[PDB]
Design a protein around this ligand. Structure first.
Ligand SMILES: Nc1ncnc2c1ncn2[C@@H]1O[C@H](COP(=O)(O)OP(=O)(O)O)[C@@H](O)[C@H]1O
Ligand SMILES: [Mg+2]
Ligand SMILES: [Zn+2]
Ligand SMILES: [Zn+2]
Lengths: 635, 571, 40
């Protein structure tokens, strides 16, 4: 060690004695040796090359060099002192060290820290990190259900997965109190030690008794963050409601993950007693428990790349980038992806191209200089179709596939419940503002089943978000404006739950024109009585009965990363001409008459298709396809 | 009164000697730590000694302490090998007794309060199961006179908290000495300690300053469950009385909301703390949990509610759902193996009675009429509990895996109608309401009843019952019901056959692909409302009929009977 | 259950210029047990 500071580990827990005992010299209560665990992890660091390291999924990870050594090299070239120690790599290497770490985290981890700092500073003498490297051990063997956890895993590193609900304000807590003598101005720092400070009680200089006063804002504080999180268990017993768990983040992990984000969370399961009343210092026999956090895994093999994941530069290998680019250059890329989306359902090519264009999303642009408000860049789809037509299953599939996906169904909702509401947090007791689905879906998708049965007091909420993406809560709690930039995937039944063919489109839909003009795509899911289609659908469904994702998500991620298509002269003139054409056509009543909103719809759909093709310029093909899809969707 | 050293000797000799060594095998298994809980049986103890049994019935808690310590001392001679120390808790107890041996000095005497206590170092738990002679008493009737007495009760569950770690023996460590003191907890609350009575501290005259931690402590699986009188138990006009029950160790996570339970325990008090005296709450400390009375082909279907006549195809489809179509999750998208039936009917054909019988039948069942369960009654809501906004469930989420028998679906509230549409379509319930932001999981199957389009378009079977007056039909039914009043398969056996039938998991054969596609297109032409939902209906009914046959392969007979049922329903 | 209160049971101090009084009592114990007078 050169002398870099040893900043304490608030998230690991309060310190302890570290009592050791001979049976060589293990830690009391544990089958651990500091020397053995330290040396085993030093071996793991120096010699652990992968059996397989897919460069495509693990960019920057080779199959030749020892794995974590080049990680230490990058932690030398840049200044963040954190090392991602995959617990399953440890499981493959040394099962004993897995047992010791995922039974005794707060003591095995500091030894791992010591070893890493020692090896790193041996390798690089003149490298300077702000403090010691810290090991983030994650991807421990997934416990499925918190409700099926036992009281034997207290302080034992677990992992679960779920979506956030709230990330409350920072809360400082003491780490090194500052004291000054009121009489003689003698100063002293007092380190927080094992959960409580030591008030000096005598001046060190003038020996006055209890003249030492605690100066607050000279002290040292690490931060905190209550992060209320809703679990997504993979085990759902017969009637276990959605479990929700409190997460206390600390100095480095605070405000790294927002509400609505979906995360695996690996962290220390920590029981803490409950005070009987807020002022009495008694406690309760019946503890609470809350997971701590040592790591959030953002990546999911079922979902697509997140927003910050797309934003970060070093996300894709050059080979993967070239694979995506040539896959784009292949002419039938759009129809290949529309076929890929939801493989179960049988050849809804038009609807799937539309849903794909939604998922890619239109181009983002700034109108602050123009002062035209904020131009909604998202896309919105209305699957208007007869009941029992797999529209609801499309809703479920896309909701699962997309991150930042929220879900509503008819009048299982309310205006305040979608916007926001003030309620007291029962752990801090302050009146806090909890978000709704329309704020959790801020940069994602809201899937709304039973969209007709969503009585207009609620669709009043949808109006503002669909026109300008702002959601102004004006209430005795707060008078503020929540961002709600949600793409919408609405599902509507016709009146009387069957598409009468006598009634025309608007007459059958029966929704307000000021709402139906907001959805920039409307699909009339109808069933022609093609017996060939019936036979083929039967064979498809029974086929799945008797019975790629990575490239798809990486493709969409690259598109969002560095594809922001712009209009061309050809595309603009075609857009004007096609808008006039559609206006002339739909001027006939019954059908949805065109609007400047529909001009915006055409522009956005063209931008989305250009994003799909990576053209970096909206083309006549794009605008022609947008026109074609709009017509064939509405017809 | 008696001498409890004599009683402990009695039960020690008993546990060693009673029977294959009945209790001996259990004792050696727990000695090796192949079981963590134990259960005394007062029938098995009345096998020899009745006075001890009557005393246990009258002062059960003390004898619980006796039995548990007796087995604790019987432990080590039954121990025969080195156990693998499966828990960090095992590591702690082994380390503790190791250092006690190290600094033993066996001649040296130690105080009456310097020793690792039983409640800490036991690592097993001992409960009971009251005798058959002990009649289960009414929850209302378990009064103050029955405090301390051993008592069994039978009641329905209303709501059950989760498993949070109750403290049993808190462990404190010092700032100077290094010993480890214990605070054995008993009550709902404890004042922490701040000073260490270790004799090194008493010698040093040092500040104790001991700090509690969870590492060396002893937590336990603790739940507080609620229970409710049986509606048959209830007197003429009073509402059903409730009761709080406390669940510990290997009694945890047995009962669940809505499931009938029989709990055997003792009715011990807690401090109440405005009239003088010394008042006290009452909780029943559970010591054996047994769900009972709901959750323990042609002749079979006719056995489904023999008191109803006719509707033979209806009963067959009901049997079919009760077996359940094959649960499928292929390629991520879920094709749930639930079967949804609606019974539209003329006023009065015993459709409500059919729903009630299915409610009494299924291992999970919830019979909800129109407005008794509306809004939160069907959905899930929020309630104060460790006080907290516990989100708990209504009817459907209580019936998360079972059968919701919905009665008079026609006149339900429109929000209830919307929720039921959601659960039939996707077996979830999304909510973004005032204080709730959830997506409940409800894998339920719907049995709607109603009186005469969305119904037709979202279902697997709709059945119109029109009792067209036919003289011979009504004559036979009249004779039948009059005979029923005149004279006034077994349900358990029926449910056992169904329970085994649930788990054969057939997979469709390729030979029937042509047959099923041909039948689908032919039914479509005969229609020309049928669609892919009706395709999935025939296909699910085929899978379920294969399950009823118990063979793992569906055949032509199955699809034939499925089309027979649907034709009968539509016509 | 709050009716009774059993004691606070405890154990020994396993593990762990100015000396401490337990050590000094120990030194007196060793001095008074093991002190030899006379000669072989
Ligand atoms: N075969 C039968 N066996 C038993 N009860 C019958 C039979 N036929 C008619 N009933 C009587 O019909 C009455 C009405 O049934 P109910 O469940 O109310 O039908 P719904 O509620 O659909 O109108 C019941 O009280 C029942 O006793
Ligand atoms: Mg009825
Ligand atoms: Zn001073
Ligand atoms: Zn002490």
């Amino acid at each position: 060690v050169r002398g870099t500071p040893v900043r304490q580990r608030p998230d690991l827990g309060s310190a302890q004695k570290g009592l050791q005992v001979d049976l060589k010299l293990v830690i009391w209560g544990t089958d651990v040796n500091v020397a053995a665990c330290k040396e085993n992890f030093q071996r793991f660091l120096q010699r652990f090359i992968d059996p397989l390291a897919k460069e495509e999924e693990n960019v920057g990870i080779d199959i030749t060099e020892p794995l974590y050594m080049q990680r230490l090299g990058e932690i030398n070239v840049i200044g963040e002192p954190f090392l991602n120690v995959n617990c399953e790599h440890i499981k493959s290497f040394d099962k004993n060290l897995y047992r010791q770490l995922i039974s005794y985290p707060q003591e095995v981890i500091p030894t791992f820290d010591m070893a890493v700092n020692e090896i790193f500073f041996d390798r690089y003498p003149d490298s300077i990190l702000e403090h010691q490297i810290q090991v983030r051990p994650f991807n421990a063997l997934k416990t499925k259900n918190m409700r099926n956890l036992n009281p034997e895993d207290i302080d034992q590193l677990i992992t679960i997965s779920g979506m956030v609900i709230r990330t409350s304000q920072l809360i400082p807590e003491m780490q090194e109190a500052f004291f000054q003598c009121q009489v003689c101005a003698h100063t002293t720092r007092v380190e927080m030690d094992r959960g409580r400070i030591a008030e000096p009680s005598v001046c060190g200089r003038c020996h006055t008794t209890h003249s030492m006063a605690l100066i607050h804002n000279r002290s040292l504080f690490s931060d905190k963050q209550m992060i209320k999180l809703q679990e997504s268990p993979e085990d759902m017993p017969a009637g276990q409601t959605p479990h929700t768990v409190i997460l206390f983040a600390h100095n480095d992990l605070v405000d790294k993950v927002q509400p609505g984000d979906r995360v695996n969370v690996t962290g220390i399961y920590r029981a803490v007693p409950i005070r009987v009343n807020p002022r009495v210092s008694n406690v309760k026999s019946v503890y609470k428990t809350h997971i701590d956090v040592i790591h959030y895994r953002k990546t999911d093999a079922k979902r697509l790349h997140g927003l910050d994941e797309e934003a970060e530069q070093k996300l894709f290998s050059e080979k993967r980038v070239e694979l995506l680019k040539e896959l784009s250059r292949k002419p039938d890329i759009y129809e290949r992806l529309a076929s890929a989306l939801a493989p179960s359902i049988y050849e809804h090519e038009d609807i799937k191209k539309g849903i794909l264009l939604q998922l890619f999303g239109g181009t983002r642009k700034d109108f602050s200089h123009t002062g035209r408000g904020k131009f909604r860049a998202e896309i919105n789809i209305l699957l208007c179709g007869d009941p029992g037509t797999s529209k609801s299953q499309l809703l479920q599939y896309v909701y699962n596939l997309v991150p930042r996906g929220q879900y509503t169904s008819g009048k299982g909702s309310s205006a305040v419940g979608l916007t926001a509401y003030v309620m007291k947090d029962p752990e801090t007791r302050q009146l806090v503002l909890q978000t709704g689905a329309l704020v959790l879906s801020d940069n994602g998708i809201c899937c709304i089943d039973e969209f007709d049965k969503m009585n207009e007091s609620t669709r009043s909420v949808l109006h503002e978000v669909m026109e300008q993406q702002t959601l102004s809560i004006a209430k005795a709690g707060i008078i503020c404006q929540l961002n709600a930039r949600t793409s919408v995937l609405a599902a509507a039944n016709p009146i009387e739950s069957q598409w009468n063919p006598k009634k025309t489109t608007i007459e059958n839909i029966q929704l307000p024109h000021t709402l139906l003009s907001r959805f920039d795509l409307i699909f009339l899911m109808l069933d022609p009585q093609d017996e060939a289609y019936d036979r083929r659908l039967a064979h498809h469904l029974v086929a799945l009965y008797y019975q790629d994702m990575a490239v798809l998500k990486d493709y969409i991620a690259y598109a969002h990363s560095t594809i922001m298509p712009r209009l061309s002269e050809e595309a603009s003139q075609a857009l004007i001409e096609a808008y006039v054409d559609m206006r002339k056509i739909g001027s006939s009543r019954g059908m949805v008459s065109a609007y400047p909103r529909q001009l915006e719809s055409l522009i956005r759909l063209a931008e989305a298709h250009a994003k799909v093709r990576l053209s970096n310029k909206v083309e006549a093909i794009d605008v022609e396809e947008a026109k074609r899809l709009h017509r064939e969707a509405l017809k | 009164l008696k001498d409890y050293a004599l009683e402990k000797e009695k039960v020690k000799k008993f546990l060693q000697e009673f029977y294959q060594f009945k209790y001996g095998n259990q004792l050696v298994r727990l000695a090796h730590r192949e079981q963590v809980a134990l259960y005394v049986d007062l029938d098995d103890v009345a096998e020899d000694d009745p006075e001890l049994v009557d005393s246990i019935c009258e002062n059960a808690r003390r004898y619980a302490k006796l039995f548990a310590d007796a087995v604790q001392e019987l432990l080590p001679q039954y121990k025969e090998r080195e156990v693998v120390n499966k828990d960090v808790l095992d590591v702690y107890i082994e380390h503790r007794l190791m250092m006690e041996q190290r600094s033993r000095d066996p001649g040296m005497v130690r105080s009456p309060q310097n020793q690792y206590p039983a409640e800490l170092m036991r690592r097993f738990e001992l409960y009971f199961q009251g005798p058959s002679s002990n009649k289960p008493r009414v929850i209302r009737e378990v009064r103050a006179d029955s405090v301390g007495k051993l008592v069994t009760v039978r009641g329905i569950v209303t709501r059950v908290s989760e498993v949070k770690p109750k403290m049993v023996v808190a462990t404190y460590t010092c700032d100077q000495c290094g010993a480890e003191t214990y605070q054995p907890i008993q009550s709902p609350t404890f004042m922490p300690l701040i000073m260490c009575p270790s004799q090194e501290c008493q010698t040093n005259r040092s500040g104790g300053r001991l700090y509690l931690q969870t590492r060396g402590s002893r937590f336990i699986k603790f739940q507080e469950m609620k229970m409710q009188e049986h509606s048959d138990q209830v007197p003429v006009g009073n509402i059903p009385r409730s009761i709080t029950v406390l669940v510990e160790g290997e009694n945890t996570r047995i009962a669940q909301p809505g499931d009938h339970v029989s709990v055997t325990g003792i009715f011990l008090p807690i401090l109440r703390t405005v009239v003088q005296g010394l008042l006290s709450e009452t909780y029943l400390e559970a010591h054996r949990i047994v769900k009972m009375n709901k959750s323990e082909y042609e002749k079979l279907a006719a056995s489904i509610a023999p008191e109803i006549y006719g509707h033979e195809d209806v009963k067959k489809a009901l049997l079919l759902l009760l077996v359940g179509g094959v649960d499928q999750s292929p390629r991520g998208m879920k094709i749930r193996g639930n079967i949804n039936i609606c019974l539209m009917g003329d006023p009065g054909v015993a459709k409500s009675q059919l729903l009630s019988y299915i409610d009494r039948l299924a291992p999970r069942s919830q019979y909800t009429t129109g407005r008794g369960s509306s809004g939160v009654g069907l959905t899930a809501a929020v309630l104060r509990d460790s006080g907290e906004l516990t989100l708990e469930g209504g009817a459907l989420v209580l019936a998360d895996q079972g059968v919701c028998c919905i009665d008079e679906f026609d006149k339900m509230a429109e929000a209830d109608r919307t929720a039921i549409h959601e659960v039939m379509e996707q077996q979830t319930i999304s909510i973004a309401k005032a204080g709730i932001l959830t997506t409940l999981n409800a894998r339920c199957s719907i049995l709607a009843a109603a009186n005469p389009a969305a119904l037709l378009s979202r279902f697997d079977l709709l059945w119109l019952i029109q009792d067209r007056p036919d003289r011979d039909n009504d004559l036979r039914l009249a004779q039948h019901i009059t005979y029923v009043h005149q004279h006034s398969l077994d349900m358990k056996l029926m449910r056992r056959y169904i329970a085994m039938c649930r788990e054969k998991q057939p997979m469709v054969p390729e030979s029937l692909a042509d047959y099923i596609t041909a039948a689908y297109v032919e039914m479509r032409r005969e229609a020309w409302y049928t669609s892919a939902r009706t395709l999935l209906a025939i296909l699910r009914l085929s899978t379920a009929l294969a399950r009823l046959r118990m063979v793992d392969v569906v055949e032509k007979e199955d699809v034939n009977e499925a089309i027979r049922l649907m034709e009968m329903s539509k016509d | 259950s709050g009716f009774d209160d059993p004691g606070i049971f405890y154990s020994d101090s396993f593990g762990g210029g100015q000396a401490r009084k337990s050590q000094l009592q120990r030194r007196f114990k060793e001095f008074l047990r093991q002190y030899r007078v006379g000669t072989d």
